[model samples]
Target chain A: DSLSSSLKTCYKYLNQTSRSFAAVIQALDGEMRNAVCIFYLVLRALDTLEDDMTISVEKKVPLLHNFHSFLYQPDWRFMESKEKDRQVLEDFPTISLEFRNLAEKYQTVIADICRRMGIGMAEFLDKHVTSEQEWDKYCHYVAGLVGIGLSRLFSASEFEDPLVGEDTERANSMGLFLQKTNIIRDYLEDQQGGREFWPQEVWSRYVKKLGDFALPENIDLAVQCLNELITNALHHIPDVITYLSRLRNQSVFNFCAIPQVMAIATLAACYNNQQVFKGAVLIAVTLMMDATNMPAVKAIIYQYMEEIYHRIPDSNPSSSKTRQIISTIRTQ
Target chain B: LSSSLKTCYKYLNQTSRSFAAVIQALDGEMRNAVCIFYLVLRALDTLEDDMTISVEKKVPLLHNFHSFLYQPDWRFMESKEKDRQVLEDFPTISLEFRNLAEKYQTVIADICRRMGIGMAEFLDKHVTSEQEWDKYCHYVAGLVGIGLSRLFSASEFEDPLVGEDTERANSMGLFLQKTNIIRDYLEDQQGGREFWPQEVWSRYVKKLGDFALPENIDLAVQCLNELITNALHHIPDVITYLSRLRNQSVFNFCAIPQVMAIATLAACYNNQQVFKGAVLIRAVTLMMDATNMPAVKAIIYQYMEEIYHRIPDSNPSSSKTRQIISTIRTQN
Candidate 1:
């Protein structure tokens, strides 16, 4: 009841903004609570600018490169953009007002990470992601950067260990894990939007074009490449397990653990499915009770691990390695 | 296995990919019943499918084809087709049919009598409406479903409820038949068969054969989606049908092609490649080997989700097609 009118508006639309993790973000507490929310909204706006196909390179590049610098400026507002999340950018004065309300230390971490992400976003806007190296690097830019910022917010709030923020490799891998899951599942969706985030390096090995998998005759080869993509996403779980295992705060742990379980389950649903070329691949359900304890949360992950393990077709080149990582997760 | 049963099973292996395994998997005398049932109909279907056979001879046989089930010695080797061996070895298959239990023989004989009569029912015609497609599919596959339903009940191994819902049983066959018709676009057109309903394809092209032209791919894919959309509507009914089975072997015999049909639908939907390549198959032997009811349902759910996922918004049929798939998904 004591929250400001604008802050409540921020909270309302915050729930409306994301389908996947917005509710988890709402479950957060302490100075960490609002800090993570603002960080997400700002980066989401920055993401929209990168995603908006209508923005010219000359104009979009500068905005992407300086999105962090603009995060604090009330003067920056635009209504001309047609992006679905246009409110975050158009009503920058309100979002920016909340950004400044955070502690200076929080503000500083947010600003610094935004700058890194903006520059990374600007660079990738110039070229197609072609190699597996490029896929990893691009995931780092859009999503890994989100990880670095969220980890710093968790640490700065003093709800978790400083090492959670300090360890960028695990932090980066956690982001890459979620990023890779979306990239793989959204193949047909992204393709329909005239975007291609699937690396040429991986998909090119299977079909003449990324869209070739859209044809039914190519489904075997499609599932083959899909298995490899799922295999790559599976590779990041060790880092995710290590990253989540280090968390101590109940609120923080639930937020971190929920999405990871959901991602693993989603990966399980997607593995060996020709549906990857058709629409979203979903293996559903996770929540506060779902991740309330480390053993309980790890049990949930194990359920999805079993789900993924059972689905790993023996014909895939990655099957042995898939079973390998799956067993390692089980031993956890 | 007697020499007669051995010859029937040998011809079964020559006829199709995995149905022989499915027929062989049935319990007790039901195994011999279905194997004989399959060979008789496959032989009848081979007559219907082969353009090389003179209509004067084929129609007279198709009109009373089930009579041969009672014939002690009858084999027609006159046709040149992949399935001619089954037709040539009819005496072997017929002897086993004669050897099945009276109840089992009644179901198989009754279905073949009706199917052969119905095969001749459409021999001189073309399908002209959705109803006609359903009617034709009933002759080709729906009667087979009813026969299987009765056979399941005829055996001591299954419950009476398995055969009670005749409409759902008919849907079980209709789904397989439409999927086969859709998947066999290239072969049917090349072999001078016209099972695709005129009411369905006339909306897209001047003739069914127009789908073969290289430049007609756009129209071809849409027509592919339209028929696939029609076939998918039969899924919910079949789900109700398949869900009632109490016997593993009977369920295995029925469920393999139901899931296989959906997989074929997934591969055929919006696929221009249906006209250029053999219809790709998936995961039926998996259905055969496991033969679990929940397992078959899970596989069907997976394929239906895929078929629903693959429909492009640009597809003229996407709106209705998606709603049908969505409603079916909700039912499951």
Candidate 2:
């Protein structure tokens, strides 16, 4: 009963930080449910630190690395957080103490991830992302590692193999896919915050300034750029499917599956849509719930890929290559 | 024109004489990955092991050190009093890190982050319980074991994930660390520190210093023998962990430390010499035996069997330990 009560507290933090993940974490059962909940909370804390631009780089870098160590220090708390997610930072000791009590193997998995993610987050804290390679590197540090960490946790929990060979690459793609989509979808939000994560490699081809994508005058190029980015994210769908197909645990399958499907749907909605530059283009709540079912997810993915292909030529002439990339995944 | 390989090699040699020798035996990319890895962790080890920095400062420094690898210009740390060379010349390591394939870089940085957090946790408190001792060792050494396993996997010398038997990997670290702690008791005590868990040593003496008394030499020998036997419990797991190695250089890298641990344990067992000075195996013997895996295995079996025969007949307290040691060899 105490265990459940403590977990409920973790879930409360989870809800406070990420609504999308809260549903999935709640769907998970047993140790994994609790492990993933805390894992999300830990990353959310790291994210909060990274997102709080007011924290000087000198202060932020150390806070992220020390954050993992603080998990074991029950009284340790960061008082400088000035963000919506600051509660997670304040309540981190509880999440972290709970982390220590997880099965040793699970604790290692979570802490291993938290430490690496913190370092990765710190590395990019000051730089403008400049290349597709840099973009991948940045996303890998922030998101791909999360995917790999989850794979290891799943393996440790006996839900999956720790993703070897092509699976490892796919596991990485899973995170990269979702991340690129989020970056594309949040173009206006990050621009408003003075954050620039869009790889200069792609953005420079169309406009000198990343923020130009938010201008009504640049709306045509912006929609064309959005289409290209969505096409790039689509390259990862096969890998995502391959990764999800290998999950043996029902809860883990659903927990991982739901977000990925939602990510694809969101990308579809955001593709070539001027609304993406104006505000978020979320899929309907009913469609999100419907997409969680395996058959429905598969259909949604195929439908989105087709929709992306049909819309491509109207937005960008270079979209022929983008169409080719989408076609490859569809054939797979 | 410092070549990446040459730079890493230079630092690897400077930081770890033994690893330098073993790592050179590895060819091409694996060598490069490991050399960079060893340097990253050594830089980390330097940060955490530096005593002049207050815990408040050192904790954050250790936590944030991994982020430096991402910054090619983040070349220096304030390890002014200890391991200063590693910190001052750290830019080379960061340069080398930038040259690594993303996969290898990820593994190395991940391990450094994990090790840093572990070192920070132990720095915050004294070892109190058996669980605390194991947890401490796991953080410090056990994670090293896991890191090496992952490196081996990445090198294609073993499975891509650490083996299914986490306990074996853990035991490998605990075995080596316990032996080191046992051997360094005097040094650590003189340095105003202790790692021998009160749980283990309290059963043998009222005060830790009592073990150093000439009059209590026999009791010291008894306690030393018990500790050696406890170290012996992990040999089976060590053997299992080693058997998975495919690359000769990697095998040598892992095997040498293990042989050295057992040899030191042999010298310390039932010997009041632990109270006198540091015990070391002959360099000629270590050099001769370090290169050959099968020979190393034979030496391990021989030392284990020798430990079994040499278990003190006078101490009834050692009988239970003797049985476990016997079972280890019997199964082997």
Candidate 3:
């Protein structure tokens, strides 16, 4: 059958939503390609709504709760969202139409994740990171749902084993690892944007206010706190290993692994390094974000692991544990 | 066809869905030979499957069901099996069986006798090892494969190599039966029966049923893919066996099921629904124009490629699965 205009529009918006994702997502089989495309677009739109500060709390709460239903409604768009920011929602008609066209198997998983994630995002809207556990919860909402949903989608497409989808813990760990990596990497950027995902409990021990980390006097304390958060993120790597090793499909394995490697490399650059608070973080951040630049995969993994292994501080309390997991992967 | 013979064909239609069509598609005297043999084995399976019948009674019946083919008056009218007509009207089937050429009769009866005693021995035992899984699939299905191969050669319509290649013939049945076993994981468990071997499942969980627990999904799917990979080892043998056939009708009879078996395994590959419910391959069963070896080989390659597309590196068996696929894909 010829490509429909409606289906083509979904791809266009997808590219606009994530230029990096647009290339990797296309590497899948035709059925999974469409399924993943729809998955990405749906979440990007939902995440956009969550990221939007302009949407009033009165309107946003009900909207997040009802986002999954809106996938069924052709007219469900964010009319008030600023034009550039809300592009995915404004064309809700094409997105919802493409979503409906997916087999029920794909549709069910995508919608369920969308439902669960939107609810979680709503809960986090009124909440702030208190403990490290709250940080895990927020990342699970924003990203672990992505892991679970993509796993389900992978299973539905028969690209990865059902265990990939069924084992939410491993899937969540993969999601959490990436989300935590990015959150840590983007500390200064998020700080500049007037947002903070760093746990108040952890940061409060070092400084009076979360923003105090960027102060020249607080550099030593900030590096210590940064290493601790990176260590916690490192804990999810075993689950990441289990999850990626089971991937039977190459396109999917690459689609999944690239971002994960990028995450690890970002952590490598972030580890025990004061550059995270400096402008130099973006050079490291932007370099690993290249979707097409995938080369020497095992080399990338080893170099990053070697980076962390060399950088582990004996003065830091979690050094032994960090060393143990780093070798587990280098040896992995 | 005589009235009595017509009744046998009607029972062939009633007793099996896919097999009935293939048995009928067979050419020359082989048609009646396979049809009668199919009805004979169906009667034996019905006895083994009907738990309502005591193991005490069932074992003896299974061991002697082959002998009933020679006795004109032997009938088991009281049996409640779905395909019980073959047992109920044993005289008509026996009369038709007696009328087939003596060579076909010898092949059918000997396989039936061996299969019956084989079924009798395993009636009470659980599949305990990988070898036992192979042995059971061999007894239940491999014997049928050998029986059909003998019939093919005896007709003078195919070469003697078709019958003499015992290992290859064994794998054809192994592929089909193993797939059936893999696809029915949930159905058999729900029915209070377990065909998944203890040795295989023990690796993943404390017991086979532990796989269905929400927490055990990862290991369950891992176990599922391992079993699937085991079945995949038989496929190359199937390709070699089918490629030897010169008769179109007989090739369709053999290769169509092989294609469907390959397709079914692909459907079941990496799927967790194998633990949740039945997954049937919706293929053309009653008719296929895989009228020659080239077409059949192409079709098999297509499905094997499908299996390759779905194979995940995450499974321990994936490397072997990929190696197996490359061996086949590279040859053709």
Off by over 4 Å in 1: A1-3, A284-289, B1-332
Candidate 3: where are CA atoms >4 Å away?
A1-332, B280-289
Q: Compose the digit string of candidate 3's lDDT tens values, residues A118-194.
A: 89999988778989888999899889989998898888777677788889889999899999998888888888888
DockQ, each predicted model: 0.01, 0.01, 0.01
TM-score of chain B of 3: 0.93
List the candidates ranked by lDDT, beginning with the highest.
3, 1, 2
Ranked by lDDT, the better of candidates 1 and 3 is 3
Error of 3 at B137 (Å): 0.5
Between 1 and 2, whose lDDT is larger? 1
Give every prediction's interface RMSD: 18.0, 25.1, 27.8
Candidate 1: docking tier: incorrect
TM-score list, all predictions: 0.50, 0.48, 0.49
For candidate 3, write residues B147-212 as lDDT tens digits: 889888999889999889989989988888998888877777788888998999998899888887
Indicate the worst ten consecutive residues by lDDT in candidate 3 chain A: A284-293
- Residue B29: error of model 3 in Å? 0.9
> What's candidate 1's i-RMS value?
18.0
Rank by DockQ (best first): 1, 3, 2
Per-model lDDT: 0.78, 0.74, 0.80
Which ten-residue region of model 3 chain B has the weakest summed lDDT? B282-291
